Design a protein around this ligand. Sequence first.
Ligand code: ADP
Length: 278
Amino acid sequence: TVFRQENVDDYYDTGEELGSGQFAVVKKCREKSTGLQYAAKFIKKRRTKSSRGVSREDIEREVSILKEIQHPNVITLHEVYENKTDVILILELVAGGELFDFLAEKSLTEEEATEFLKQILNGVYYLHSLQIAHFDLKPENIMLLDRNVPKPRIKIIDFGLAHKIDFGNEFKNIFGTPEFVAPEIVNYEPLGLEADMWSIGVITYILLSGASPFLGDTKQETLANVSAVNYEFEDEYFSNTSALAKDFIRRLLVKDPKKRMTIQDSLQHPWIKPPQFE
Ligand SMILES: Nc1ncnc2c1ncn2[C@@H]1O[C@H](COP(=O)(O)OP(=O)(O)O)[C@@H](O)[C@H]1O
């Protein structure tokens, strides 16, 4: 599929840089015709078949998935442009920064943690209902609308690894960040929606303790720890955390994805119910 090939600068003015990645830069922008503000994500295209940059197939998948999405806890896609060097996604602007940077700024109370977590679970419930595995859930990829309110609203971002799972598993290894990937990712096994639920367990552990449960001194050591389910609840961090909070995490950090809580399970859980190489 092809995208709008007019000069994006004819229709938008760009401002501050919001973030960077592996083959992408994200800049604040403003649409001339409406005055409304967005985040423009410039994704570098492949220069040759083999090659740096993102394959066209990968970009088209990300765009397809983004076009399906509309939910308060997920980013939305406004428009897509392209030229010879970049595909440019005009995304909904999320102005309150990453949950990652919020966590560095403030460890949270259980209430603060569950307020974020309920929103994350609602967003993932929506995605999984559409058979979309995000495959890159981590605090960097959960943005706040406004960081200066007592109960910030969040949106899930970064659909660069997301896949539609039409058979209950998919086989291509979709390897994210070692600290957050499930054992089946580490072991290059078929992957499904269950992989996101593991990442949610890791996120929850971090929200409650300020510490990463599998992190080693090298990426390879992290991956080994993940495959062996080498984590524990350090008394120093968790001695006054409720046993139900620990129960929630335990039921997500399970090696066998068939035995791991589903997104629907996580919403009925009593605590809730009201790149890889060195
Ligand atoms: N919609 C948005 N609103 C505000 N900031 C964003 C938005 N999308 C991305 N960012 C910022 O840019 C960074 C990189 O975005 P990302 O989608 O991860 O690109 P990459 O393909 O490089 O990983 C994010 O971690 C975040 O800081």
